[PDB]
Design a protein around this ligand. Sequence first.
Ligand SMILES: O=c1[nH]cnc2c1ncn2[C@@H]1O[C@H](COP(=O)(O)O)[C@@H](O)[C@H]1O
Ligand SMILES: O=c1[nH]cnc2c1ncn2[C@@H]1O[C@H](COP(=O)(O)O)[C@@H](O)[C@H]1O
Lengths: 184, 187
Amino acid sequence: REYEFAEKILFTEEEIRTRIKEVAKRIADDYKGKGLRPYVNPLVLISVLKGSFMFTADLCRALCDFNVPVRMEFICVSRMLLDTRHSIEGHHVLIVEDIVDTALTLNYLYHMYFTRRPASLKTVVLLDKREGRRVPFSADYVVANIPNAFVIGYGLDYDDTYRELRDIVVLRPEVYAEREAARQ
Amino acid sequence: PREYEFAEKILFTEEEIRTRIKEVAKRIADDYKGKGLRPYVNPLVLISVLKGSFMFTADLCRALCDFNVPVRMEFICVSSYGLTSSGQVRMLLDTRHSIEGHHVLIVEDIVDTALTLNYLYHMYFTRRPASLKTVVLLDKREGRRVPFSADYVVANIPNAFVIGYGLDYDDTYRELRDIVVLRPEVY
Ligand SMILES: O=c1[nH]cnc2c1ncn2[C@@H]1O[C@H](COP(=O)(O)O)[C@@H](O)[C@H]1O
Ligand SMILES: O=c1[nH]cnc2c1ncn2[C@@H]1O[C@H](COP(=O)(O)O)[C@@H](O)[C@H]1O
């Protein structure tokens, strides 16, 4: 599809759907010998709002396909604004994130929950800007790698806009300037 | 169709839901053709009522994009209080922005007894939004405890305990692709 504010398309929703199916395939095998079951010992997807909402709805669906018992958790940051509802102490957790850049965020999340003692703590990210860490972090599961660029859609946003896009696209440079200043 | 041993009968498949959401999304598109909805300035604000609307929402918002409907996505989390019969729930997460002078759309998984949905509505009505409406995937008309009509309805249903595509039984089965009826031999 083509857009007005996109400098170029990155990941079409078809390619995306494909990369997700695949990763959930890897996830599925990796916890095979883990005695995961509904109710008692399911895979706890701790998803981070609001940028992984799309990723999480599609990926959790990728996992039912591989018959993977899962628990949905939603937490928010901006600061901790919404924490987990139920405990992850003695559970396998999957911190679902949208994109790792500086990693300053996921590192914080990881340890916090790491000090929460789950049976194991792993991370899936939809998009990963490997070339920009301000600090070391390695996602366990990665759908796609992207260069240091501002991308929107598939849940991803600029000022809480362009999230509902079906595709991952690049925000035209002369569009964020064009608004960032109208802002700041 | 897929198998669901824990399910006695599938109600709706992903594709049926798809067809119904898309349909609903165009209807939302004509109804707002004239309110000059625009990004940043005056989008369609989607108030997703966690945890159940998460799947509906991800899908809903895309169909709407297809119809060029600029949507602002908001997510709210709530918790029962008991203590309550008015529909009173505790706010764990509120919207990032105000809805004042805004075209707002509450997004529920299922309207049933409607106490919560009716309660949030009243909550948000008092925040002076440009307009306030609701879309619900599922609706169990009879089951009211309070009079409540939704502005959009993906599909109607009888009083079954349903599950899937967001909807849960004791935090279970929401990850499912289709909406199915939890079989009696499981409660
Ligand atoms: O290109 C981007 N598009 C959308 N959000 C981004 C982008 N880069 C960073 N972010 C947001 O920045 C948050 C923190 O990134 P990090 O802490 O540097 O890994 C992410 O969860 C994203 O929501
Ligand atoms: O048929 C159902 N299956 C699963 N959960 C349901 C069903 N009906 C209501 N719920 C849950 O209970 C909430 C209450 O809806 P209410 O009865 O209209 O207030 C819903 O949002 C769901 O989380």
